[PDB]
Design a protein around this ligand. Sequence first.
Ligand SMILES: Cc1ccc(N2CCN(C)[C@H](C)C2)cc1C(=O)N[C@H](C)c1cc(-c2cnn(C)c2)nc2ccccc12
Ligand SMILES: [Cl-]
Ligand SMILES: [Cl-]
Ligand SMILES: [Cl-]
Ligand SMILES: [Cl-]
Ligand SMILES: [Cl-]
Ligand SMILES: [Cl-]
Ligand SMILES: [Zn+2]
Ligand SMILES: [Zn+2]
Ligand SMILES: [Zn+2]
Ligand SMILES: [Zn+2]
Ligand SMILES: [Zn+2]
Ligand SMILES: [Zn+2]
Ligand SMILES: [Zn+2]
Length: 310
Amino acid sequence: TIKVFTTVDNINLHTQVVDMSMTYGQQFGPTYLDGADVTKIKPHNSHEGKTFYVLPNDDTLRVEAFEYYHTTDPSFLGRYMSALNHTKKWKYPQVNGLTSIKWADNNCYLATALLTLQQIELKFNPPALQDAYYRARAGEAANFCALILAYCNKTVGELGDVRETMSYLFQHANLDSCKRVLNVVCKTCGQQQTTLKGVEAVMYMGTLSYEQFKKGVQIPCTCGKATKYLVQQESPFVMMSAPPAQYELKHGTFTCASEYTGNYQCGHYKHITSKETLYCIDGALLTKSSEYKGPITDVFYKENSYTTTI
Ligand SMILES: Cc1ccc(N2CCN(C)[C@H](C)C2)cc1C(=O)N[C@H](C)c1cc(-c2cnn(C)c2)nc2ccccc12
Ligand SMILES: [Cl-]
Ligand SMILES: [Cl-]
Ligand SMILES: [Cl-]
Ligand SMILES: [Cl-]
Ligand SMILES: [Cl-]
Ligand SMILES: [Cl-]
Ligand SMILES: [Zn+2]
Ligand SMILES: [Zn+2]
Ligand SMILES: [Zn+2]
Ligand SMILES: [Zn+2]
Ligand SMILES: [Zn+2]
Ligand SMILES: [Zn+2]
Ligand SMILES: [Zn+2]
């Protein structure tokens, strides 16, 4: 009989003694070591003293699981460990002071989101996401990528959209202070002002240029008449998205952008970031240029407080 530690958060640990003749599942339920399902595995003597992730079976473990992950979904732990088994084996090179991911298992959209998160100000609500966020910015991003897949209900290898992934992530972040007051002017219906908050205040689908959003875009009116322009914006950033089109990216006018080339869904993502010059991060590959023209679908801008003059 070996002694062992079980946990759900790797924070609050539990002393447990396990019989060497019964499998972990027969004593704890679904049990994992570093993402590897050991439910049907008998204890090895090398497993003495190690910490095992277990599915919550009592109320103390259920509460701890929520406090760290902010979910009661019983499938979360298993989807997390299943992804972790792959992401632990990816390569996370430092590219231009940023942690990227070497290409594997169609992870190009994950790497793009990982690079973007290192360049915008964001606080995650679940401690599990926040703690892994910090570890990722220091170069150890395996646990962070697995959580993104789990929180986004995505599996390793599945085809992912960066804008959808960012949106999912924003919903698990503290964006309560974010505000976007908008205005629509129709010839017949009149004028109308809408105030969006949270995730809807920081994302727009339609145009890539923040300037174009400030000037105003064409939207159909409720009576079929209109123009919609940004009045006030109170957020640490904004994300502008449009379907992949050729776009000129000028140094200093944006933070970072998503380049998408190829067919819908089965394509490939590249990350454009604006430093002292334009940089292109394609997994572990890095290229720099003074100007950039190419197929962009997301652009990220910096912000704090903006009030229009119209
Ligand atoms: C790589 C990938 C994986 C998954 C998905 N999702 C989309 C729908 N989602 C509910 C599923 C989970 C699958 C999309 C894609 C994907 O390729 N995304 C690119 C950026 C894309 C978007 C749009 C477009 C037009 N409107 N909106 C709202 C988005 N159009 C494109 C046209 C041509 C080429 C690329 C386009
Ligand atoms: Cl919550
Ligand atoms: Cl890829
Ligand atoms: Cl969710
Ligand atoms: Cl949610
Ligand atoms: Cl949350
Ligand atoms: Cl330049
Ligand atoms: Zn405990
Ligand atoms: Zn929460
Ligand atoms: Zn794999
Ligand atoms: Zn969730
Ligand atoms: Zn109208
Ligand atoms: Zn310049
Ligand atoms: Zn790819």
